Structure 1
Amino acid sequence: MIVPVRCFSCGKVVGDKWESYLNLLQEDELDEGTALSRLGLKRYCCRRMILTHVDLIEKFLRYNP
């Protein structure tokens, strides 16, 4: 259920960062901590935003209609 736009706590936009994050893990073969920092997610309120996001929309899209 899709990358939340903006970090709840602080407000820093996080909606534009999801796909870039997956590529950094996949292609670039980086660890989550360096990837989060590469995206400029310095505060832990922003790190938890992406690190703990579960993307259920992918599952939801798998349904036939």
Structure 2
Amino acid sequence: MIVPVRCFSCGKVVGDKWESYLNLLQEDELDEGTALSRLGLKRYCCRRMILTHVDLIEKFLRYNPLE
């Protein structure tokens, strides 16, 4: 849905890195691995937190009932 605040295994804050990861991928495009490493996501648990996240909240917001 929305990016989890913390890595499930580590407890490291990853909820402040989703947008920077997206802008690293889009603006001045980087590979996913180097984008993850540039954000400090060194451990593979924190890496998968961002790598495997499905941003479903954007799809959910298309059906906003309070327009």
Alpha-carbon distance in structure 2 between the residues aligned to 1:41 and 1:6: 12
- Identity across the alignment (%): 100
Q: CA deviation at 1:64?
A: 3.6
TM-score, with normalisation over the residues of structure 1? 0.97
TM-superposition CA deviations, 1:11-49 (whole Å, max 9, x none): 100010000000000002001000000000000000000
4+ aligned runs moved over 4 Å, structure 1: none
Larger radius of gyration: 2
TM-score, with normalisation over the residues of structure 2? 0.94
5+ unaligned residues in a row in structure 1: which ranges?
Answer: none
Q: CA deviation at 1:51?
A: 0.2
RMSD, aligned CA: 0.6
5+ unaligned residues in a row in structure 2: which ranges?
Answer: none
Residue correspondences, number: 65
